[PDB]
Amino acid sequence: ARKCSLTGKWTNDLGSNMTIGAVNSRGEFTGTYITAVTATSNEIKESPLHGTQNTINKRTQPTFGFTVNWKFSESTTVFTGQCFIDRNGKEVLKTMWLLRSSVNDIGDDWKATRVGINIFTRL
Amino acid sequence: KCSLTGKWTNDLGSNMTIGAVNSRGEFTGTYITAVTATSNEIKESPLHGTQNTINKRTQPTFGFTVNWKFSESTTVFTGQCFIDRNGKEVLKTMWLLRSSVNDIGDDWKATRVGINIFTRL
Amino acid sequence: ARKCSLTGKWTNDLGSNMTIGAVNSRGEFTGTYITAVTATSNEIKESPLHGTQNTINKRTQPTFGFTVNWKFSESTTVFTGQCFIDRNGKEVLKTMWLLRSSVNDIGDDWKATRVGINIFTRL
Amino acid sequence: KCSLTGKWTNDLGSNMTIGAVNSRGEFTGTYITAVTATSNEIKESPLHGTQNTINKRTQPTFGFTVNWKFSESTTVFTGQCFIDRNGKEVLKTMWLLRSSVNDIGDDWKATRVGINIFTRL
Numbered sequence: 001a002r003k004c005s006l007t008g009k010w011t012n013d014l015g016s017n018m019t020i021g022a023v024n025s026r027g028e029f030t031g032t033y034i035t036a037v038t039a040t041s042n043e044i045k046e047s048p049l050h051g052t053q054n055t056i057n058k059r060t061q062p063t064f065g066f067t068v069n070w071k072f073s074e075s076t077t078v079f080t081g082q083c084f085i086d087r088n089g090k091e092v093l094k095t096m097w098l099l100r101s102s103v104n105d106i107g108d109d110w111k112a113t114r115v116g117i118n119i120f121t122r123l
Numbered sequence: 124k125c126s127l128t129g130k131w132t133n134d135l136g137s138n139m140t141i142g143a144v145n146s147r148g149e150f151t152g153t154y155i156t157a158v159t160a161t162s163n164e165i166k167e168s169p170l171h172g173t174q175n176t177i178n179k180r181t182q183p184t185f186g187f188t189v190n191w192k193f194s195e196s197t198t199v200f201t202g203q204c205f206i207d208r209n210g211k212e213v214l215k216t217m218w219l220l221r222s223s224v225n226d227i228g229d230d231w232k233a234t235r236v237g238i239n240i241f242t243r244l
Numbered sequence: 245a246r247k248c249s250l251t252g253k254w255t256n257d258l259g260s261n262m263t264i265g266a267v268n269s270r271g272e273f274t275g276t277y278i279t280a281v282t283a284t285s286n287e288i289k290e291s292p293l294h295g296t297q298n299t300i301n302k303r304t305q306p307t308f309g310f311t312v313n314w315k316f317s318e319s320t321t322v323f324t325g326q327c328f329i330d331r332n333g334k335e336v337l338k339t340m341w342l343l344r345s346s347v348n349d350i351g352d353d354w355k356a357t358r359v360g361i362n363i364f365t366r367l
Numbered sequence: 368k369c370s371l372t373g374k375w376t377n378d379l380g381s382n383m384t385i386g387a388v389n390s391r392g393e394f395t396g397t398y399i400t401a402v403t404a405t406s407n408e409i410k411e412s413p414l415h416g417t418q419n420t421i422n423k424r425t426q427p428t429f430g431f432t433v434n435w436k437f438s439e440s441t442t443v444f445t446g447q448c449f450i451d452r453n454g455k456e457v458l459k460t461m462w463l464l465r466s467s468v469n470d471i472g473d474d475w476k477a478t479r480v481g482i483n484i485f486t487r488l
């Protein structure tokens with residue numbers, strides 16, 4: 001089997017793109033995310049992400065997580081999922097995400113977390 | 124003025140340390156979990172994340188990833204740092220726990236979800 | 245060990261309340277929910293809920309699911325959890341929920357779902 | 368005009384039928400899943416839920432619970448029925464799969480999360 005590697009430029013059906021740089025010996029990587037959609041009402045900007053891939057037993061399809069530090073919103077998104085060789089032999093990232101909104105009041109914390117999936121292929 | 128830096132615990136008795144948050148909002152930390160979904164022995168594990176600095180909010184949101192050192196799994200946490208008028212701090216978060224599955228046909232069952240509330244330890 | 249039963253009036257820390265009726269032999273139940281808070285700009289009203297308790301292997305601490313059909317918004321929330329006898333011998337419902345907002349456009353689907361917990365105790 | 372009533376399938380080839388939706392928005396249905404997290408043999412299982420009828424929207428939200436007949440688990444699904452200019456419908460949902468745990472101490476790991484997209488026939 002190929003190893004599924006995170007390093008590279010990725011896209012989803014929507015056409016958001018993200019670029020992940022080299023993954024270091026501690027499993028750390030950095031990258032940038034450019035979303036095609038927003039919950040905000042200002043200009044979208046390219047935002048950094050930082051995360052780690054899990055290296056336990058050196059799996060060829062490893063899990064990973066990362067945090068996107070949005071540069072245009074007070075929110076944060078975290079993604080986690082796994083790098084798979086898909087049925088067609090291509091790498092695919094199968095992820096899920098939580099988008100945390102900023103709320104003014106701790107009484108509103110209950111409504112601040114949205115959840116979804118995101119599936120990425122190489123661009 | 125709600126800062127992520129410090130030692131934190133939850134009601135379960137898991138603890139977390141977080142270091143200085145740099146001017147880009149990056150921090151690293153450790154997480155020692157009281158419980159695992161695994162049969163392995165727990166080991167303190169590193170975390171890395173960022174705090175959101177847009178508009179220098181006093182109660183910022185943030186995310187981090189815990190890179191478990193006794194499992195093939197990864198957990199992410201996101202939430203917000205609340206600070207009351209005593210200056211008591213609370214991090215209210217939700218997490219996704221991603222297990223490693225051997226086949227892509229099992230991906231659907233690989234992601235668990237929950238909350239974790241942390242106070243200063 | 246008591247059987248943990250869904251039937252009864254329940255509250256959470258926030259003071260939202262819920263009443264669940266008799267659970268039938270097919271494990272169905274009906275009730276009502278009054279939420280203390282809301283994410284819409286709308287006026288809050290008591291709303292019905294309908295769900296089932298799982299009765300496989302007649303467990304004393306069953307899982308269950310229910311849908312709240314909000315009467316004051318176009319939203320729906322589903323809750324699922326388990327009815328435990330807690331360490332102190334009280335019943336407790338430990339649940340998680342998904343709150344589905346109505347969006348006007350399919351392209352907004354990605355952001356229509358919030359997630360949370362709710363812990364109920366008998367009122 | 369987006370109606371829930373019908374037989375539905377997803378990319379995995381799970382199927383679901385939903386019957387008539389009454390004037391209170393209630394419906395019942397069945398779910399035959401292609402996959403399971405369990406080691407039991409899958410059996411068709413009943414589902415019950417409601418469609419939201421406030422402002423009688425063309426693309427209403429709805430929820431339902433699947434009462435699995437081969438597991439101690441329960442799944443809830445919630446989402447929205449979308450209908451294109453052509454009359455082609457799709458149900459975009461997310462779900463929580465609650466496992467049964469023996470002790471309240473394991474509750475934190477009992478809830479899995481996912482999506483499911485259904486189409487007609």
Ligand SMILES: C[C@@H](OC(=O)N1C(=O)N[C@@H]2[C@@H](CCCCC(=O)O)SC[C@@H]21)c1cc2c(cc1[N+](=O)[O-])OCO2
Pocket residue numbers: 012013014016035036037038039040070073075076077097099116117118119350351352353354
């Ligand atoms: C599930 C969804 O996820 C994404 O691809 N998403 C993106 O690429 N961007 C949004 C991001 C929001 C950045 C926000 C900052 C803020 O608003 O605070 S986080 C997940 C979502 C998606 C949305 C779509 C879509 C296809 C997909 N998808 O392919 O997964 O088509 C129209 O909208």
Ligand SMILES: C[C@@H](OC(=O)N1C(=O)N[C@@H]2[C@@H](CCCCC(=O)O)SC[C@@H]21)c1cc2c(cc1[N+](=O)[O-])OCO2
Pocket residue numbers: 133134135137156157158159160161191194196197198218220237238239240241472475
């Ligand atoms: C919801 C729960 O969350 C946690 O605190 N959790 C932990 O501190 N540990 C587990 C972690 C699992 C490490 C695993 C690596 C692997 O297994 O693959 S991730 C979230 C959960 C929790 C449980 C409790 C509690 C308070 C909280 N809480 O505040 O988060 O009191 C009684 O039990």
Ligand SMILES: C[C@@H](OC(=O)N1C(=O)N[C@@H]2[C@@H](CCCCC(=O)O)SC[C@@H]21)c1cc2c(cc1[N+](=O)[O-])OCO2
Pocket residue numbers: 107108109110256257258260279280281282283284314317319321341343360361362363
């Ligand atoms: C986690 C949270 O959950 C609830 O209690 N929730 C409620 O009782 N109400 C909201 C409901 C919203 C109905 C919305 C219709 C619409 O807006 O579209 S859905 C579950 C959530 C909660 C919020 C709190 C709190 C304690 C808890 N809790 O104990 O879980 O203290 C002050 O705010």
Ligand SMILES: C[C@@H](OC(=O)N1C(=O)N[C@@H]2[C@@H](CCCCC(=O)O)SC[C@@H]21)c1cc2c(cc1[N+](=O)[O-])OCO2
Pocket residue numbers: 228231377378379381400401402403404405435438440441442462464481482483484485
């Ligand atoms: C995300 C996933 O979800 C499903 O379709 N699912 C199913 O139809 N079956 C599993 C169910 C198992 C219930 C369990 C009883 C028990 O084990 O306790 S609940 C949701 C999931 C899915 C998987 C796929 C797919 C498309 C989708 N989808 O559209 O959601 O194509 C390849 O595999």
Ligand SMILES: *[C@@H]1O[C@H](CO)[C@@H](O)[C@H](O)[C@H]1NC(C)=O
Pocket residue numbers: 011015016017034035036123
């Ligand atoms: C993603 O990359 C493609 C090709 O580089 C480009 O045409 C598209 O606009 C990019 N998406 C965004 C949101 O920038």
Ligand SMILES: *[C@@H]1O[C@H](CO)[C@@H](O)[C@H](O)[C@H]1NC(C)=O
Pocket residue numbers: 132136137138155156157
């Ligand atoms: C958390 O720290 C406390 C006291 O400092 C300690 O007794 C407890 O063992 C720690 N929890 C874990 C899982 O290490």
Ligand SMILES: *[C@@H]1O[C@H](CO)[C@@H](O)[C@H](O)[C@H]1NC(C)=O
Pocket residue numbers: 255259260261278279280367
């Ligand atoms: C919960 O019920 C108690 C009545 O016992 C009531 O005082 C409280 O306000 C109720 N909550 C709501 C939202 O009605």
Ligand SMILES: *[C@@H]1O[C@H](CO)[C@@H](O)[C@H](O)[C@H]1NC(C)=O
Pocket residue numbers: 376380381382399400401488
């Ligand atoms: C779904 O329906 C199709 C035929 O209509 C059938 O071939 C398929 O096996 C069904 N799926 C399951 C899981 O029963």
